[PDB]
């Protein structure tokens, strides 16, 4: 609900400016480091047939979301745990310790971990993976501090959309991350490239919610 629904809000708004349509434009003004987002997914794994989605979050913590819709964290540390139960409720534990209702997952999390660290390039309190899906052309993960990130397939580029400061980061074709005020894109306007893009996120953030 509220995140996105503030998402949807703020992308009708700079779909509306039509900032692509202007002459001049002057994308440059737009941009505002105080909104640069701290956290990312910077790999993801989709066995969502038999397991669920594994990805790794820019700070170098992995996640599952698991086809049972329960989901697992392992912070960056290699040892700290974070469970979050159907029903939202959180529990913190150890790989360490050996919890004997986890270890299936904590052996399929460390599975996903390897996986991402031997063979996928990274894209660049803390959120778990609380809602994906994908399309033909990008998948959409939307994180649990409110911020749904776009990952367009066919030229690797990708949007990070923070509704917190109404703000929007996009990762080009050659991993250069800019952030933008929305309420400055509606102003100065920007290329097609990041216009067509964001008629797409609003799309998708529409589809989030009615999910």
Same mark, same amino acid.
């Given at each position: 609900?509220?995140?996105?629904?503030?998402?949807?809000?703020?992308?009708?708004?700079?779909?509306? @400016? /039509?900032?692509?349509?202007?002459?001049?434009?002057? =994308?440059?003004?737009a941009?505002?480091?105080?909104? &640069?987002? &701290?956290?990312?997914?910077?790999?993801?794994?989709?066995?969502?047939? *038999?397991? #669920?989605? #594994?990805?790794?979050?820019? +700070?170098?913590?992995?996640?599952?979301?698991?086809?049972?819709?329960?989901?697992?964290?392992?912070?960056? +540390?290699?040892?700290?745990? =974070?469970? &979050?139960?159907? +029903?939202?409720?959180?529990?913190?534990?150890?790989?360490?310790?050996?919890?004997? @209702?986890? !270890? *299936?997952?904590? %052996?399929?999390?460390?599975?996903?971990?390897?996986? !991402?660290?031997?063979?996928?390039?990274?894209? #660049?309190?803390?959120?778990?993976?609380?809602?994906?899906?994908? %399309?033909?052309?990008?998948? &959409? $993960?939307? $994180?649990?501090?409110?911020?749904?990130?776009?990952?367009?397939?066919?030229?690797? %580029? /990708?949007?990070?959309?923070?509704?917190?400061?109404?703000?929007?980061?996009?990762? +080009?074709? *050659?991993?250069?991350?800019?952030?933008y005020?929305?309420?400055l894109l509606?102003?100065y #306007?920007?290329?097609?490239?990041?216009? @067509?893009?964001?008629?797409?996120?609003?799309? !998708?953030?529409? *589809?989030?919610?009615?999910?």
């Amino acid at each position: 609900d509220c995140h996105l629904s503030d998402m949807l809000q703020q992308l009708h708004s700079v779909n509306a @400016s /039509k900032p692509s349509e202007r002459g001049l434009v002057r =994308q440059e003004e737009a941009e505002d480091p105080a909104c &640069i987002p &701290i956290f990312w997914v910077s790999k993801w794994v989709d066995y969502s047939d *038999k397991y #669920g989605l #594994g990805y790794q979050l820019c +700070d170098n913590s992995v996640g599952v979301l698991f086809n049972d819709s329960t989901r697992l964290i392992l912070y960056n +540390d290699g040892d700290s745990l =974070q469970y &979050i139960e159907r +029903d939202g409720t959180e529990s913190y534990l150890t790989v360490s310790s050996h919890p004997n @209702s986890l !270890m *299936k997952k904590i %052996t399929l999390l460390k599975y996903f971990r390897n996986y !991402m660290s031997e063979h996928l390039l990274k894209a #660049g309190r803390l959120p778990y993976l609380r809602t994906w899906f994908r %399309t033909r052309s990008a998948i &959409i $993960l939307h $994180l649990s501090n409110g911020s749904v990130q776009i990952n367009f397939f066919q030229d690797h %580029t /990708k949007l990070i959309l923070c509704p917190l400061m109404a703000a929007v980061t996009y990762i +080009d074709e *050659k991993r250069d991350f800019r952030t933008y005020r929305l309420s400055l894109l509606e102003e100065y #306007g920007c290329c097609k490239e990041l216009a @067509s893009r964001l008629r797409y996120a609003r799309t !998708m953030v529409d *589809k989030l919610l009615s999910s």
